[PDB]
Design a protein around this ligand. Sequence first.
Ligand code: FAD
Ligand code: NAI
Ligand code: URC
Ligand code: URC
Ligand code: FES
Ligand code: FES
Lengths: 98, 1300, 49, 49
Amino acid sequence: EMGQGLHTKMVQVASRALKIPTSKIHISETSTNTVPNTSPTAASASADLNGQGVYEACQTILKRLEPFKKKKPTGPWEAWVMDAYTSAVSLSATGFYK
Amino acid sequence: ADELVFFVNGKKVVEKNADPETTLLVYLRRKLGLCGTKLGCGEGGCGACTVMISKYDRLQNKIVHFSVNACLAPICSLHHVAVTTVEGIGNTQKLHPVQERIARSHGSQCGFCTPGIVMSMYTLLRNQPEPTVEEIENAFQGNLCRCTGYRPILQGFRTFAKDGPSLFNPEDFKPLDPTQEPIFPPELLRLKDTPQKKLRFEGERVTWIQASTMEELLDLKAQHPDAKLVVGNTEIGIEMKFKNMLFPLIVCPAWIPELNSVVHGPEGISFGASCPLSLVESVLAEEIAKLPEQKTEVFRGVMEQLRWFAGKQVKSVASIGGNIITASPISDLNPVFMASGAKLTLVSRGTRRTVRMDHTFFPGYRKTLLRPEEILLSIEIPYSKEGEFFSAFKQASRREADIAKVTSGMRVLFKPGTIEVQELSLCFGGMADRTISALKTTPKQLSKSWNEELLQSVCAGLAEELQLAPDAPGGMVEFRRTLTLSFFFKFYLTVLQKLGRADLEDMCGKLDPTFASATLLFQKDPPANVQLFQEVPKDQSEEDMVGRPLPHLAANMQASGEAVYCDDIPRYENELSLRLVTSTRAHAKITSIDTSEAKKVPGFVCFLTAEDVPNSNATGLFNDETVFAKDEVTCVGHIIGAVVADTPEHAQRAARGVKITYEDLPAIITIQDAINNNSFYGSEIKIEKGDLKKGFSEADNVVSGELYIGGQEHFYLETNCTIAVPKGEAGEMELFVSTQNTMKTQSFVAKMLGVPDNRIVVRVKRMGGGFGGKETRSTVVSTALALAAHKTGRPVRCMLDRDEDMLITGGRHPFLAKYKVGFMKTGTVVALEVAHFSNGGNTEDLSRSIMERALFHMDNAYKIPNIRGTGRICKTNLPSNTAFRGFGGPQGMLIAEYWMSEVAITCGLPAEEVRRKNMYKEGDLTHFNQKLEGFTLPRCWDECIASSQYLARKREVEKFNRENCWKKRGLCIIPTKFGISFTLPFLNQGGALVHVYTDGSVLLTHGGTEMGQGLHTKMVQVASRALKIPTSKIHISETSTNTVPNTSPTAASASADLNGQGVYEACQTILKRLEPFKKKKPTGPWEAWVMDAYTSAVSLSATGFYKTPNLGYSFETNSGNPFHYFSYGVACSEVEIDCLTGDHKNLRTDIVMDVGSSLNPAIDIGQVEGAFVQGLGLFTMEELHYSPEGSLHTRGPSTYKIPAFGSIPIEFRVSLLRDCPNKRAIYASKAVGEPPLFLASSIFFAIKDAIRAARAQHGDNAKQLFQLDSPATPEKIRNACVDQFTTLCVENCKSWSVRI
Amino acid sequence: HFYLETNCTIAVPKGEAGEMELFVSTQNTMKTQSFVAKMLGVPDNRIVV
Amino acid sequence: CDDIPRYENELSLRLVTSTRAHAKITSIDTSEAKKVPGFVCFLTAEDVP
Ligand SMILES: Cc1cc2nc3c(=O)[nH]c(=O)nc-3n(C[C@H](O)[C@H](O)[C@H](O)COP(=O)(O)OP(=O)(O)OC[C@H]3O[C@@H](n4cnc5c(N)ncnc54)[C@H](O)[C@@H]3O)c2cc1C
Ligand SMILES: NC(=O)C1=CN([C@@H]2O[C@H](COP(=O)(O)OP(=O)(O)OC[C@H]3O[C@@H](n4cnc5c(N)ncnc54)[C@H](O)[C@@H]3O)[C@@H](O)[C@H]2O)C=CC1
Ligand SMILES: O=c1[nH]c(=O)c2[nH]c(=O)[nH]c2[nH]1
Ligand SMILES: O=c1[nH]c(=O)c2[nH]c(=O)[nH]c2[nH]1
Ligand code: FES
Ligand code: FES
């Protein structure tokens, strides 16, 4: 983030992808020890590239929660998450795009 | 003047404003940034702060070197010396030989004790470049290690000794070149010529005068008698730090020649009162070596007490006068000086008197007959005369560096050529509020002959004269009284021997040879150790390190002091300090809080209370704990608030100015109190199988009894610590914490603040030990510090002092068990009912899971067809007890072995045969219906019983016992089965995250935390095998909630299993992505494949995850598997008890342990040894005492005695079972951390056998199935050895402590 | 460019294994990491930007 | 970045740059720099590990 509102856009993207409010999603920083081998934030393309990455990471989380959404199609997000945790389903994912 | 000038690692320090209250430890760490030197205790017991001092000694005219505790050394005592710390001797770029050898020999696990042990060894070598094995052991009397079990440290360092597949290769160690040590600072040699002048230092509260001459000291003491002398500071530093005493004027007379001289006279040797005990030791040793025996009886008595007096670091600065004037009731020296009539010279300006120490020298508690203006100049320790004999005795909880329960000097003088007593003096510490002489008893024996009538007369006299009130400070009244008589008996027998050697054998009689062993001075054979493990296959790559003995990855940095623990992280310029304020009542209303005095302390910021919590004051695993007490306190140690100030010193002073007013409420302390009040955490827990009424009806025999097991303090050498760094945006905060549980730390902070988990990051690089004590209880510090940081917007830090940590954070659960066992004459067990109670303290925490694990292990190794176990967790007004390595298993299994011991005795059958024939077999179901597959316990048993030569040794024990009346041996072999996996199924999960950067280097992280168990090492081993690259290309930096979320605690021995699988899977994901590139360049290196993947836009980051499958037990249906697999092992241990004192030697221990196909046999053997030694502590040495009002008495290493270098089995053999792959865990390994601990019960049951032999010997009465509670301490052992002495020493009623 | 914030780096050494954390005003964490690691002669895995 | 609090032990760095477009460096004299209070060191190419 250099003032272009990239984190803003990525939170907008993640909120749509996950179908949860932006308020539930936070970006703190950019670090080489969370995402390696990154291109510079350059060439106007950083929302295009990272937005796709974010979208794919979110799709992976959604695929993992699918059975729990099936069992409780109304129960809130928080119930699906906690059910996944207590079922020992991973709640971390990477995402990538080229 | 007033500038303080010294050197640190060769660099000149000029301190223009030295505060007398500043210790060298705090100066090194906080002023100079040298954090290799650690705080472990602040009271001289642990040696973590050990450093070397060099100076030019003007009195001996040469450069000298000695070790000190930096935690107790005032900087103001150090003008014109040269300090060497761990950083001064070497670093990872060029390690000193001492650093190299401890690292490469697997002598460093958590690494917190390593710098101090390094400096103890380094100082020895600077003094003695070719030490003996014995000298090496003695170098560490002042150093504690909680992780390693000491064996590897001594084995590594034995390579320096002149008389000294494998785990390490000593042939690859680089040789020592003494010419390459640091120069003695040339400036100090130049300054040696300048006369010493008096110095004055002024601090915030204290003025220090370094007196140069006797005239200056005497003048000062006449004008200002309140001026407090400080020499070694080993008493005054304690008084100031822990008893909050403030002496605003101190005078240090250490430089004065008259107080430092040694004069040989016709009557004896005169020591200046400031002479260190190290100098007393060296002088008396020389004199004992060259003078006739007849003249050195008193010298040898002093030497015997000095042998068990602290360690090298204390003795180098502790003064002979300091001990005398402190006048502690438990001085080990004063009884000897009193008994020998040592001559003291006292001086004041214009006065001089000499007195013989006698009863009158010590009027009342910690008083002497010195006038306030007087100082002690010298003490003359006398030559013994013809016909004069002397013994000194001490019995404590642990031999080495411990407070006497009773201590004594005894002197007899015979009329020449007779066995008739001319003079008799029996003097004792630990029997009154002062050193006492048995002045009513000894006059009666003058002119009697040395014979049985004199022995009986003196014993009856002592029993009547040395009475103790039931409420005597320190308790153990029966034990202490028994020891006075027992010591006198030893002296009586010794004097018979001494008379014999003077040719009066015909007058006094010879000693029955079965009595001789009673008089022997303590000695241990030199150690002998064996480690056996399995070589990896011949075809295994040299770069595949799985199964190889790779040293802990941080060992070199731990040895060099470069490894960073939480409090070693530099402070921010704006960082504040926090101190917790805790309840001094077990159960009370808080009526009011007055912070008026706190607010006056300079640098005070605020006092946080419940009102300051932004969101929720409800915390703890089961949400039944306060962040800060609200309206009432529910234990002594309950956190009421926290002071925030600029410095730790100011925070301490401000916390003392927080005045709390209470109104007491009915307290529930003990398990019995809880039972009476129906005060429990939840319902009874139960496992039952078969038909109990039927089994008892069919039994030939039925035995009932109870057993009590004391709890245990973790004594991680690094206490609880948190740094909280607020980020000023969106509630973001980062915390650096010594914790096993990053997830609960983050959750609890976020809940207290009322912010989402996504705002809070918790980072752990390493812990200096955890052992379960940092699974949950770390969070009580973390939440307080996080609030402080939120409120101020500044970084805030808190590291607990040892006393705080021991009070607040709880321990292993005490257990009371009531058992009934039915069995056949053959020893076969057919029925068992056991009711278990634990003392949980004032929050639920992990207490119910701990009880479940105890119930899952109430079988230990044994098939029992009709079985009923219950457990209840008591809710009490005590600090909350928590996880400790074993997690209820050791308590459950000790109860099983205890009734098993009584089964064998009742049947009159060999205990090993009874255990063997009750053991499960392959395919059996447990009492909870889990099938035992890959059941290796019978192999472990057969291997151990053969390799230990148990049967031939049984023969030798029986022979020893028939030939010795007052020492007995015991020998026991004990098995174990330990279920692996958290009892809560979903905690059996783990995650990893791996990155490959474009240079080919790999950054790995996983949910597990490093606490000294070598988890990161193992994970690197695993990753290197999985990726087929060398370990050198893979790095783990830390554990973080923002790289792997939702992690289970590093607990249940399971972390390598869980994280190893997650690492493996992350690695397989990377390899799958690199496959097409590997296929195109099957030869071209790893780096080419990586760069090809990158420039093809292939992701080089992956998560990995694992969950243990098929777990989930139901208590309702007694079905489903709680455990993934079981650990197995066997230990055979041998002991020799002293029936007259309750001391014992651990002669030999042999362990065979099933660790599957070990991931790392060096680390695994280290886990076996370390776990075993913690169990040795649990069952034999470690004991917490509590007032009847629920106040923990036992708050530091002075009183809480963990195993020392000298405590371990003399012969210590460990074998890892061969050819036993466990394919359901990572690379066919098994978990190792907790299962070995219970095997130290072999020492407990060897002790029990030896007591049984003692009770057969003496006592006219016996009583089979005698009680031995845990821990089997010297008190419990001695009291069980009933004899003519215990008989003479034998409600309701206030006492010093209560059984909780 | 006249970015209102000029170029700025804080480098925090960790004293172990060549590890170093850098707080940087940069658009290029990867090249920052690479260039630091190469100058120091340590692997990329030691350097966090 | 610069708003982050300094550590108590944090040091400050300042680059020394060329005042010539193209030149050999004949010599460098740091005698006056060494006299400034709080001076620690002057890093050059020879310091690169
Ligand atoms: C780890 C540890 C283990 C210990 N083990 C033992 C043990 O096994 N047995 C035992 O008996 N003690 C033990 N001690 C107690 C302590 O080490 C000794 O009492 C020590 O001898 C005190 O000497 P010092 O020079 O450090 O005294 P300081 O603390 O400097 O002074 C002690 C007291 O003596 C006064 N004083 C000192 N010199 C004079 C003088 N010349 N004239 C008048 N007053 C004077 C001081 O004013 C002060 O009141 C232990 C202490 C520690 C820390
Ligand atoms: N740190 C260590 O490892 C060691 C320290 N020391 C000494 O231990 C001391 C401990 O100091 P404190 O805890 O204040 O203990 P203290 O000096 O009050 O002595 C406590 C002991 O004194 C006896 N005692 C006191 N009053 C009594 C009474 N009325 N009746 C019967 N017995 C009584 C008991 O033996 C009791 O356990 C230190 O000052 C030091 O001199 C000695 C050995 C080891
Ligand atoms: O095609 C581009 N490549 C870059 O590296 C770059 N950097 C930038 O600022 N804009 C562009 N565009
Ligand atoms: O079954 C266990 N659960 C835990 O939470 C734990 N903690 C520990 O130290 N050992 C164990 N065992
Ligand atoms: S910290 Fe100094 S001896 Fe423990
Ligand atoms: S390695 Fe010794 S206390 Fe941890």
